[PDB]
Design a protein around this ligand. Structure first.
Ligand SMILES: *P(=O)(OC(C)C)OC(C)C
Ligand SMILES: *P(=O)(OC(C)C)OC(C)C
Ligand SMILES: *P(=O)(OC(C)C)OC(C)C
Ligand SMILES: *P(=O)(OC(C)C)OC(C)C
Lengths: 217, 217, 217, 217
């Protein structure tokens, strides 16, 4: 019943100019992989809102790149119904809705294999180039990433298939009201942002994302 | 328990440049006042979300001006809790939140006394100069309005005091989930709006709003 | 200077219902691979209009799938200038223009390795499911193909990279006037088609193409 | 060498339902006739492509009707050669081709005698009932028009004979490449038109065109 959605994007870009604290480097990422424990995916750090699971994190010459799976029907409905949409097809309407509402990732860290805590989908992340892609196929989710080492692609596909076998069939169900409140919060807390689409456009460029994306920026 | 909030603003400006359909003129407004029936105030036209009542609508030389009352504790909690706010005192926080989240009014019309149907608080209205002010005192809510005919002030104060006497003590209770779902909707349907704060700044100027407003534009 | 464009799509679907003559089967395709000689890519069978080269043809359980490269700047200009376009970005404008003008492939056959003669880009092909995809990356061109054996993907990527090494740097230049006349011909000869977009939509479905494609059907 | 082709049709219908701007009325047309200066005929408003001349424009009770002459051998060759035609006799092939490729007229206007600027042959015009007829005889070109005031016929024949005497022998020669580039453009800019033949069928009915026309709609 749930539309399995794949998210892909950089958790961080290595020499991007992230402030002192936020910055991530090759050796620290090297030491965090593979993660000791699975990285759950939640909405706007509200840890009650688990909606998926990070399948693979690969250290790309540009930064730690990841691929996740979101199998949550409540998240679908809550979004589908909120959209008193004027302006398609079907799950594409869903792709269009999640991409533009939740265009960024945000990695939380607690060096060793337990450094990476979890990833949160959000409107605007704190590190650069953190704009993600959503699609119903892993290959389709990673394709808009043109500045990606060939090895990263081949490795993220391999790990992601195995990883899927485990949580095969798992669906998350955080609670429609929990979901509803969490997304209102994502809006209310980002209302004071002067034109967020500039940042989106800018960070989409830094990530090397290009193509016929649903992202309207 | 509810913090009575006063909304004030122009429902429309007379010679502003509103498209054919939306345009309002002095004669039509003349004929519509006083309203046959009280004007309820709701959030984003979702009639289920009645949160207040329009006390006075005076035909100012510039356009139909209004003053309304919002007495809803659910709206307060729904907003207060969504704000995982970083960044003043108390109900001022409340003022700050609603002002920037729902900065515009929108008058629905069904000429005679039954023309004006209701007013909806919203992010961006379709008529110019429709930026409102919120405050815990009627006098405070109308003060930022500098291009206001002296008669309009004395008239809007007089009717408001009376009008309040009737719905004195009334508190609206649409239901927190209805509120929660309506506000997310306000957020989702306006996500593709490029910048928005420009329009808010422009239309604030048009209305002649000036002062130490919570409106961050 | 030329934008290398990748085309991908089925040259034919195995049990699709193609008329007696046009039909292709597994064993006949098996016997034609690898092609004795490279398969050039031309516009609407006008053999003077060579604009690219077929990189790989892989026998997929569904039909012979191929991946080609178009490196032609004249084709770019002729299209870019014809489009007195109302309605983006850049080479995407080019992607949008070539996809919707030339949405199909047409394989010409002269069984043995010399069966496959060449492929022609055209508006509407004669065999079913022959709707192609164009993109600036091979991976991005094949991603909209969801009903594709995993082996096909891994094989078409391997062959295509090697093949590219040979014609690396090759650009085609058929002649802008030749190009101009050939494309007018594509239009004039398909004018009598009652709604071609129905077929496009239909044959896009038969191919298992899905996603945020430039193809406006 | 050129095959003189006669075009006939309504430049506009009086009470058809043309949007605000495009709408034409009897008085304005009255004032515009006769045209101050001859009306050249071109392909798709590209003023470089003058291919004929409007002989008569008579104000019929239904709308401004016209009869024009097209004497251009390049247009003939450009069309004849583009058609890698499968599928009657000769100049009839020519009739068949132009009729279905450029089935509509479009009157550009700059009220006084200088209102009408020129008419452009095109695929789909913006005003209703603008479907034209082509033939090698004026009488043949106006015959399909059944809802035509008897006066209009006798008037349009009379002025046409005279008008011809002046531009008697004139043959236009825009240049085959100009022609070739203009026609591709006609094709590229109308590629996103869903169906088109419906509109052609509808507007043929509106004009009151009936008969054994080459127009395949
Ligand atoms: P993330 O990018 O934050 C990590 C640095 C913890 O963004 C949050 C604010 C949603
Ligand atoms: P209001 O300004 O609309 C009235 C014209 C009915 O704005 C709506 C779209 C929230
Ligand atoms: P192709 O699909 O034709 C082969 C069968 C030779 O289409 C042509 C008519 C463009
Ligand atoms: P015509 O009908 O346009 C006039 C109104 C100028 O059609 C053009 C768009 C070819």
């Amino acid at each position: 019943r749930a539309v399995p959605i794949y998210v892909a994007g950089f958790l961080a870009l290595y020499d991007s100019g992230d402030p002192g604290e936020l910055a991530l480097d090759p050796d620290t990422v090297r030491a965090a992989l593979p993660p000791e424990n699975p990285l759950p995916i939640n909405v706007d750090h509200r840890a009650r809102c688990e909606v998926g699971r990070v399948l693979a994190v690969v250290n790309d010459p540009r930064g730690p790149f990841f691929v996740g799976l979101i199998a949550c029907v409540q998240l679908e409905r809550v979004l589908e119904t909120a959209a008193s949409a004027a302006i398609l097809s079907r799950e594409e309407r869903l792709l269009y809705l999640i991409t533009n509402y939740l265009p960024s990732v945000s990695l939380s860290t607690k060096p060793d294999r337990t450094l990476f805590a979890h990833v949160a989908l959000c409107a605007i992340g704190r590190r650069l180039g953190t704009i993600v892609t959503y699609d119903t196929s892993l290959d389709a989710a990673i394709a808009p990433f043109r500045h990606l080492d060939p090895a990263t692609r081949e490795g993220v596909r391999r790990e992601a298939a195995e990883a899927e076998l485990a949580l095969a069939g798992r669906t998350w169900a955080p609670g429609v009201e929990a979901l509803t409140h969490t997304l209102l919060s994502t809006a209310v807390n980002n209302m004071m942002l002067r034109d967020r689409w500039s940042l989106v456009a800018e960070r989409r460029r830094q990530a090397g994302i290009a193509g016929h994306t649903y992202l309207q920026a």
